[PDB]
Amino acid sequence: ITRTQSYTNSFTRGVYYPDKVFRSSVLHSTQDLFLPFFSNVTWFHAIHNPALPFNDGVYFASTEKSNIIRGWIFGTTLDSKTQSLLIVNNATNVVIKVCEFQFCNDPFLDVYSSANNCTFEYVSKNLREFVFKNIDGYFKIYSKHTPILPQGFSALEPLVDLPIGINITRFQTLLAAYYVGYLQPRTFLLKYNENGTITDAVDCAL
Amino acid sequence: DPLSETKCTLKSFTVEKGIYQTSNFRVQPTESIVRFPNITNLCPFHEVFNATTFASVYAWNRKRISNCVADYSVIYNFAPFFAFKCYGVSPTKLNDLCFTNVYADSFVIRGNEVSQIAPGQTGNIADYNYKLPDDFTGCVIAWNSNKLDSKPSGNYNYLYRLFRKSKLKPFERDISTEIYQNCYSPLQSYGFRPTYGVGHQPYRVVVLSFELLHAPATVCGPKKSTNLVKNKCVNFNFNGLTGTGVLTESNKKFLPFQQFGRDIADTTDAVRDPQTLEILDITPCSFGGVSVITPGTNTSNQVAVLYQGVNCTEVPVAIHADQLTP
Amino acid sequence: NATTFASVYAWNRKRISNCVADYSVIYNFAPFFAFKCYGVSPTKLNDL
Amino acid sequence: NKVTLADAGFIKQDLICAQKFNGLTVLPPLLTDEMIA
Amino acid sequence: KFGAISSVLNDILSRLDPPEAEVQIDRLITGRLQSLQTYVTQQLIRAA
Amino acid sequence: KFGAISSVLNDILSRLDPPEAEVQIDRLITGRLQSLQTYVTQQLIRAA
Ligand SMILES: *[C@@H]1O[C@H](CO)[C@@H](O)[C@H](O)[C@H]1NC(C)=O
Ligand SMILES: *[C@@H]1O[C@H](CO)[C@@H](O)[C@H](O)[C@H]1NC(C)=O
Ligand SMILES: *[C@@H]1O[C@H](CO)[C@@H](O)[C@H](O)[C@H]1NC(C)=O
Ligand SMILES: *[C@@H]1O[C@H](CO)[C@@H](O)[C@H](O)[C@H]1NC(C)=O
Ligand SMILES: *[C@@H]1O[C@H](CO)[C@@H](O)[C@H](O)[C@H]1NC(C)=O
Ligand SMILES: *[C@@H]1O[C@H](CO)[C@@H](O)[C@H](O)[C@H]1NC(C)=O
């Protein structure tokens, strides 16, 4: 119910594979929504709280022992009119819905009072890193789990891209410490080594 | 003979002393193979084009098609349209391609608004109801339904959005009924009557959109796979990727979401078999250049041949007329 | 919406000037299907 | 030893492979190094 | 003009939809590229 | 691409009928020829 925030730095973190093509021992220049190097990310502690903004995609980092953090909600107004996206996952199985939800303020899981016009259903230390994007009706997710803020590189692979066809400008979490950063469109130079894995990257406008 | 080839290259009947770079030799493929995923069930196109009710344009109806065998030639049996309107592909090749998954969007509009269902268009329909990307790949089908969605008194079951604060984005919808902000209702209903003109009559529209095979394919045309041949110069067809070359077992590491690999010049070098899920390297078949050495036709017609940059033990030896270019 | 149109050998010419032209309203006056424009595009006609 | 080449166009039974597979080749000189020496 | 309707990008963009604007713009692109290439070749020959 | 749909001839042959495939292939042919010509001209100038 209560939340406090600090600010920290990202040491060249949040790089993902932009295509499903195998390459090896090359340098490739790409342009897409990336997390700029040496950003000013936010660090939230939650103790027992408005809706965070969703400018354009988001980078999420967490270091938790178990399923303390469960899912997310996305939308514009979230009250009764605008259709809202709800994603809830507990044991690697995720329920995703796009319904005119009525979300209770300060939602938590033991979220919404009522839903209408869902028209959609979908069932499917360690640092959890996630990247969320929403472009041209496609809501896309990249994820990675890294054994360990830290330095170095660790690429992220793509889970699913789904058609929702809704405008998203705010997002909220339902579950506790985590890190949040925001993406921007820019150009990167990536290095592929022998085993088609990205080893180094250069930000083209830093 | 090589001397005749030299004469033709020089466009003359007399050739002097020297060594002339005549032409290039290549090895021809032996056989052909086709590799497609094994699937039996058919795609459900009958429930889309022969539905009893079509949704309103402001709330268009979407259907997802995946994991089926797609036979497009049957679509002509369901609706009395005249022709497809396809962007990025031609309707006659749709049975020769594999797609990841397909989307079918259905609705109803007025006759003269059908031109707004193309890329790069504006207007109320294309601004506030249904928008399409500037770079679109797919097909559009529209046909008249005057004898189904028209009533003598007037049909008011079809709605469209007139006012909106801002224009939509490709493949975006909103179904709210908030009073527009001297206050006007946002939605208005077509008045459809049988006596109106051709441009004022109802039209049913269905849009098919595909994905251009950047991942494993779940919907493919009705084609039959063949056996797999590795170590011979052959023509191959992997899920629509056509080529000529020699296949070999590969040791490259492909992540489960990776289907093939490219070269510096965006040339395919490795593929993943759709059935056995093994990695295969692809190489071009043998090629080289030939030069003809002659002492001049004014003296003799004896010539020597130089194969450039090849090992003598590996020079072509096939005697069949359908194995070399010369 | 003229109740009568002239013959081909005497085609009727009308001049329009000094007014605000909105080309989206003429879809409601005749039951035609589409324009045929050379040099411009109909969807841009309100930006000129 | 000081100057390093790429290839003198000898038998070819990377970048050079791409060049060869697209019809670009290199021819050897008429005089070998021993003759110039 | 190099075979295009106009020699100004803005007019082509304000008179045509993007699908036709692209085909109109490629011709100007090709012409100007050819001009630059010719200039550079002449400059090299003079520098020698 | 030189303004064509793709950079691979096989894809163009697979997705389009010959009447449109020729249109798409002409652009690639012209671009490749231009590249070869510029390469050869520069080689001549260096050989001098
Ligand atoms: C990061 O953002 C906070 C937000 O107020 C600001 O105070 C701080 O100066 C910024 N830079 C760093 C390095 O923290
Ligand atoms: C690729 O993987 C192999 C096997 O794990 C390893 O021996 C090799 O060092 C890796 N390549 C690089 C460049 O590290
Ligand atoms: C559409 O479905 C109905 C219901 O089964 C059927 O009677 C009709 O023949 C179908 N139309 C066509 C063209 O097959
Ligand atoms: C059929 O399914 C896939 C290919 O689509 C692959 O597993 C294999 O070719 C077949 N399945 C078997 C043999 O279990
Ligand atoms: C041609 O191939 C044979 C096969 O081993 C090899 O011994 C020979 O050296 C090759 N030719 C040349 C010029 O090296
Ligand atoms: C315009 O044409 C319609 C025919 O649909 C007619 O009813 C109407 O009277 C015409 N307008 C005027 C001002 O007469």
Going E2 to E8 to E10 to E14, the CA torsion angle's sign is: negative
Among B46, B50, B53, B81, which residue has the most ligand 3 atoms within 8 Å of its CB, making it the best to mutate? B50
**Other CB atoms within 10 Å distance of the CB of residue C5:** 8
Contacts of B171 in chain A (CB under 8 A): 136-137, 163, 165
What does DSSP assign to residue B127? I
- Cβ distance B22 to B9 under 8 Å? yes
Using only C-alpha atoms, what is the Rg of chain B? 30
> Parallel, antiparallel, or unpaired: how do β-strands B102-110 and B304-308 relate?
unpaired
Q: Which residue has the tokens 């005497």?
A: C10
> Parallel, antiparallel, or unpaired: how do β-strands A177-182 and A58-62 relate?
antiparallel
What does DSSP assign to residue B126? I
* Long-range contacts of the stretch A69-72 (C-beta < 8 A, 24+): A69/A173, A69/A175, A69/A176, A69/A178, A70/A109, A70/A174, A70/A175, A71/A109, A71/A173, A71/A174, A72/A171, A72/A172, A72/A173, A72/A174
Secondary element (H or E) of residue B18: strand B18-26
Instruction: Please give the sequence-ordered ranges of beta strands (E in DSSP) within chain A, or none if there are none.
Output: 2-9, 26-34, 40-47, 52-53, 58-62, 71-75, 84-89, 94-99, 122-123, 126-135, 138-147, 157-163, 170-174, 177-182, 184-192, 198-203
Closest CA to B138 of B205, B202, B80: B205
**Other CB atoms within 10 Å distance of the CB of residue E20:** 15
d(C-alpha A140, C-alpha C39), whole Å: 42
d(C-alpha A134, C-alpha A162), whole Å: 9
Judge: B121–E17 Cβ closer than 8 Å, yes or no. Answer: yes
B267 Cβ below 6 A of ligand 3: no
- Cβ distance A141 to A131 under 8 Å? yes
What does DSSP assign to residue B179? P
d(C-alpha A59, C-alpha A44), whole Å: 14
d(C-alpha B124, C-alpha B110), whole Å: 12
CB contacts under 8 A, B 221-280 vs F, are 240-243, 266
Closest CA to B322 of B46, B22, B24, B31: B31
Q: Which residue has the tokens 């003109």?
A: B197
Q: Calculate the alpha carbon distances from B113 to A166, B143, B238, D2 in Å.
A: 24, 13, 41, 74
DSSP string, chain E: -TTSS-S-HHHHHHHS-HHHHHHHHHHHHHHHHHHHHHHHHHHHHHH-
Q: Calculate the alpha carbon distances from B205 to B50, B106, B139, B146, B310 in Å.
A: 12, 6, 11, 13, 61
What does DSSP assign to residue B180? B
For A67, the token pair is: 């399923």
Amino acid letter for position D11 = I
- The SS3 of residue B200 is helix
For A142, the token pair is: 């990249």
Q: Which residue of B has its CA nearest to E16?
A: B120
Closest CA to B205 of B157, B144, B159, B155: B144
Q: Which residues contact F43 (CB under 8 A, 6 or more apart)?
A: none
Instruction: Please give the sequence-ordered ranges of beta strands (E in DSSP) within A10-83, or none if there are none.
Output: 26-34, 40-47, 52-53, 58-62, 71-75
d(C-alpha A166, C-alpha E12), whole Å: 33
DSSP string, B207-221: EEE---SSS--SEE-
Going B276 to B277 to B281 to B285, the CA torsion angle's sign is: positive
What does DSSP assign to residue B125? I
Q: Calculate the alpha carbon distances from B291 to A83, A200, B109, B133 in Å.
A: 73, 48, 68, 54
Q: Which residues contact A198 (CB under 8 A, 6 or more apart)?
A: A15, A17, A153, A155, A190, A191, A192
For B9, the token pair is: 């290259």
- Cβ distance A142 to A130 under 8 Å? yes
d(C-alpha A65, C-alpha A63), whole Å: 7
Method for structure elucidation: cryo-EM
d(C-alpha B200, C-alpha B110), whole Å: 6
CA distance D5 to chain B (A): 18
Contacts of B266 in chain F (CB under 8 A): 7-8
For A192, the token pair is: 């592929």
**CA B78 to ligand 3 centroid distance, Å:** 8
- Cβ distance B281 to B318 under 8 Å? no
**CA B249 to ligand 2 centroid distance, Å:** 19
